[PDB]
Every structure is written in C-alpha cells, then in structure tokens.
Design a protein around this ligand. Sequence first.
Ligand SMILES: Nc1ncnc2c1ncn2[C@@H]1O[C@@H]2COP(=O)(O)O[C@H]3[C@@H](O)[C@H](n4cnc5c(N)ncnc54)O[C@@H]3COP(=O)(O)O[C@H]2[C@H]1O
Lengths: 349, 349
Amino acid sequence: VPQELIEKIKLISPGTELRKALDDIINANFGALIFLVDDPKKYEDVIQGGFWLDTDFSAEKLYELSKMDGAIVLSEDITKIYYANVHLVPDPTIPTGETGTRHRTAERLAKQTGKVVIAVSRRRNIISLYYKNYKYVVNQVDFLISKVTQAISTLEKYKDNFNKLLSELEVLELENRVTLADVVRTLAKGFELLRIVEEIRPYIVELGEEGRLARMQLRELTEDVDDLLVLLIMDYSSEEVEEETAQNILQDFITRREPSPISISRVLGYDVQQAAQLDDVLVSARGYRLLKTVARIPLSIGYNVVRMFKTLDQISKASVEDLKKVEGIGEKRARAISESISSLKHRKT
Amino acid sequence: VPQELIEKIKLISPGTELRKALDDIINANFGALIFLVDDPKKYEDVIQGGFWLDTDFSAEKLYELSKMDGAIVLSEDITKIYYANVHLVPDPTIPTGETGTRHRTAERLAKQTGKVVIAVSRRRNIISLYYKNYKYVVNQVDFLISKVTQAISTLEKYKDNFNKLLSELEVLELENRVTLADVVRTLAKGFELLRIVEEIRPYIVELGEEGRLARMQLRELTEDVDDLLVLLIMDYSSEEVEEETAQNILQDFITRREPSPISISRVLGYDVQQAAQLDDVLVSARGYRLLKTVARIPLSIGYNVVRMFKTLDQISKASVEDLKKVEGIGEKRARAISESISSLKHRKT
Ligand SMILES: Nc1ncnc2c1ncn2[C@@H]1O[C@@H]2COP(=O)(O)O[C@H]3[C@@H](O)[C@H](n4cnc5c(N)ncnc54)O[C@@H]3COP(=O)(O)O[C@H]2[C@H]1O
C-alpha cells in the first residue's frame, strides 16, 4: 500500500475530528460526499451551486451540513469547510468500476483532480476513500477490533509453540545434540509468528487511536523475537554470517520467501534435498545467542570468542583463564560468560 | 405553450398508461428519472451501465423498475422499455437553473439531446417534464379539479350576469331605446366570460381524460356566446361590418385588447373619451341578431334584408309583401321574420 495513500488514510482514522464526524454521519444514516481541495477557486468547473461557507472546520459543523443533499468541500488539511450542498460534475468519460451516482462521481473526481474524495452511502457503514487512481475502504472500529483480537489470540498460540521449541532447542544446544531439523523447525515457527504480525499491521494502523492497546499487546508478545531469530541464523548458518546478512535473511522469510523446511535449510547454506535428511544433519551453535542474550557480550566481541573457541560447546569448557586470552574479555566478561553457561547447564540439563 | 411541447405533455396526461405508472410512483414516494429515445444506440454516450431490457412497456413494469436507483430509458412512443438502473451523464457545461442532481440531470439531458426527460422526486407529488429548452410541471388531478371547479363556478356567475344584461338589452332593442352604454356593458361581460374560458383551457387540457366532464360543462355554459357576441358587434358597430370583421373583433378583446368601456366603444367605431358619454349615444340594431337567431335567416341573406331596411325597427314595420321584395326572402322567410318579431314584442314588451 503506497505511502502517499497511507497519508490520506490517516485523515479519517479513529481519533481525528473528521472521523468523529463521519462516524456520526454513519450512525444517522445520512450519506456523504466530501471533496478535499486546497484552492477552492480553481475548481469552478467540477463544483457547481451550493453554499460558499469558508468557515473553520469542526465535527459538528460537518455533521450538520451532511443533512443537506449534495457534497461538501473541505480544505486538504481539514481546517476549513469551503462549500456545502454542491453538485460535483467530474468528466463522464473517465473510466469507473463503481456503482451508483455518488461512488461513480467520487472515483471520477478523484482521478480527474488527483485529490481526495470521500463517499459514504446512507445504508452502509463503510467509508470509501478515493485518491487519484486508488480506492481504500475503511472499516468501523468494531469490525477491526474483532479481527485484531483474533489475530492476537492466534499470535499467543504461535508464541506458546515457539517458546516450547526454544526451550527444547536450548536443552539440545547445552548438550550439543542439535540437528538441522531442530533449528529449522524453530526458525520456521519464528518466521510464521512474525508474518502474522506483518499481516495484521494494516488493521492496527487503520484502528488509529483505538489501536493503542493492540500495539502494546503485539509488542509484549513479539518483543525480542526478531533478535532471537537473527542470532539463531548466525549460530547455525553453514558458514560464518554477518548480523546484517542474518537480518536480511529474516526479512526475506518474513515477506518474500516461504518458510518451508528445505527452503530454510537451503538458505542457511546446507545442501539438503528431502526434509527427512534434516534429522540426519548435526550442527553446533557458534555461541552468539548465549554470549549476547545471556552473558551480555556485544556481538563485535562475541565474534572474537567464537573466532577462538569456534563453538558454544568449547566455550562452555573454557576456564576464566582460557576466556581471558580473548580480545575484549577481561575478568568481568570472562566470569559472566563462564558463570552464565555453567548456570544454564546445571539448571536446564 | 408551443404545439411541440403540448404533444409531449399528452404522453403523461391522465388516461395514459405512463401517467398511471407515474401516479403509482408518486404514491409510493419512489423517485424517477425517465429518458425517452427511439434509438438507444445513438445515445450510448449519455447512457451508462444499468440493465438492457428491450421489453414491451407496461405501467406495472415501469413502477417496479422505479424501485431501483438510477434512470429508466423508454422509446419515444412509450411502447418499449430499453434500460433500467442507468447512470445518465449529460454535458456538465450545459447551463441549468434546476436544483438537485436529478432535476439538473434531466434538464441538461433534454437540452443536450432534444428529447423528453421526466423527473420525479420522492418527496413531492409533481411531475417535471423537460423536452428541449422547455420545462413543464404537471400537477395531480386533485389540484387541477379544484382550480377547474372554481373557474366553472366563476363562469356560472359571469354567465348569469350576462343573461341578465342580454334580457334587458332585448327589451331596449325591441323598444328601440338602446344606448351605447347598454351594448358596451353587455359585450364587456361577454368578453370577460370568454377570457376565463381561455385562461382555464390549459388546466382542462392537462386534465386529460379526467377533464371530460369539465369540457362538457364549459361547452354548455358558453354554447352560443361567441356567435351572440359577433352578432351584437354586427348589429351595433358604427358602420356596416362583415361577420369576419366581427369575429376578429371578438378574438381581439378575448386576448390582446382589454375589454374596457371606452376601448370597446372605440373599436366599435364610436369616438368617445369618457365612459359617461356612453349613456348619451343612441344606437339601433341592424337586425342581424334577431334575423339569424330567431327568424333563422342565413347571414348571407340577412345582409340583403339589412341592405334594404337598415335597422330592426324598420324591419319590424314591414309587411310580408314588403319583406318579400328582398332577394332570398319568400313567403316563408317573410313570415318567419314578421311573425317572430311581432311575437317577441308582445311577450317581452
Ligand atoms: N445522472 C443521474 N443518473 C441516474 N440517476 C440519477 C442521476 N442524478 C440523480 N439521480 C437519481 O436520483 C437519486 C437521488 O438524487 P439526490 O440528489 O437527492 O441525492 C443524492 C445526492 O445528494 C448525492 N449525490 C450523488 N451524486 C452526486 C453528485 N454528482 N454531486 C453531489 N451530490 C451527489 O447522493 C444522493 C444519492 O445518490 P443516489 O444515486 O443513490 O440516488 C439518485 C438517483 O437514483
């Protein structure tokens, strides 16, 4: 959805004065045809009759004016009401796939002028926004909340399964018994979880102010998921991979590519044919995930540790003395690494 | 009202199936916009979307189709329904003094194509017919009947005073005591009476089949008034005058010229400037009225009788033998003339 169009959508999103007025118009079953222009004098060819108002905008004024037949003309920033009860006359030759005089008029005028035109039928509760060659149907909050609440509840389920796969993989990592199947399975669920987030995003935006709690819920649920997926990619990719490259891997599986077993294993650098082979491939974590998230060791410094010990397994066997031989690790970071790992092994395994 | 428009108005007059449908539409508060054209193909630029029907017309079909939004397209003779639910798009630059999309659309389309377009709003009970640059509002029968009934009542009153004036003029005429004032007063009342008929005529025409009784009443009330007035003009005009000149005099006072005492006397060939003078001008009827109406003597032959005697007074002093000295008058005409005058003088004076 183009950004130039997303900007216009904000104009009638829950929270704005304009939307408050449109909600009331809908509740009263009045119809509405609103034309947003900047220079009223320049549309004497498409705007006919009505009353010249040139007054300050307000939700109550718009509502009251919508009681009359015809269209209302507002300024682009919704600060002035220019005309009311006007007859809009766009070029009849302009193609339109709309039905009815009001919507056909709205699409034609928007295409002809490159301006925003809002239409509301008397019987229905949707707001149709036309801008240039675009058409966006805005829904009432109740419909949006139902979809968003369902999506969140769905996300909770995926997240619960992600957490179980993660704790299981954690045990396998600490014991160095991880297979490519385990890794890919965890990444797959992580990619599916973030995809759901991406798909509900437009619903959230459209909710405007009414989407505050929904946003907070999405944040609490998916907080550090992205980072976690990036660290897993770095820890299990066939060959050393830069963080940015890992983040790009993530972005691709979250939008373009499809998170299938073989496909994920393929992008990780493993030449696998059948998904049954995944259980056959053994892999050892580099150690980034634990070093950063648990030992609180910056990636730039974690590279150094991996460069020397190569795997988490070796890192877990290294003494403080051993660890201090690494650039960037003093008695403090050496203790943190050593202690955080020995603590997890004892508690988890 | 041009004969051209008059023909179209008949299409929606009480009695037609079309009008029957429009009345139902009005009674149901549905709206309507109807475009009459014989070759739809040629107007495909002003007719958009909708449903192609091409079916035989019926009042029930038109009524049902009017439940949908948009416009209906019928053949000019109203025998076929071509489209329903269409969007009519006439040129926006066409000037119009109408209000609302529906009526502004109808006027522009009518001007643009030179055809008939019918508009009916849901809120009102009138039918607006637009043809070319003409606009005729058709009213419901109830409104028309009320106007027509009051006009008829008014005519009865004028006719009564007319008969009172005529009866008194009859006495004076027989006694040869007529003054210009007597004649003028009678003519003025007769002229005023016929003007009312002319003014109410359009209402009766617009009443269609529901105006049958009204036409009968008008005819019974004004049956022989025109002839009577023409004969009065011929009998009292300054100098001899033909039936054609008289008939023209009548038409002038019923439309163009105002029937004022001085104006009537002036047109009769009398030089007067004050109404008071009228009671000072003694006049004598030629005899045409009595010869034609009572003696049943053809005007052509009446000219001969007046040629010889000049006035009714002299005609009543003639004998059968004397009267027969006129060409066209035999013992029969002579008897009818002589006996009819003598009988009236005995009964009226
Ligand atoms: N060119 C045309 N072709 C076919 N039918 C025509 C027509 N123009 C008017 N009408 C018929 O008249 C109905 C009501 O017209 P109205 O102006 O009261 O009530 C209108 C008007 O206030 C508004 N509206 C529609 N088009 C407009 C325009 N171009 N400019 C300003 N207001 C418009 O939306 C209301 C409802 O529109 P809707 O079509 O549902 O309802 C229409 C339609 O069935």
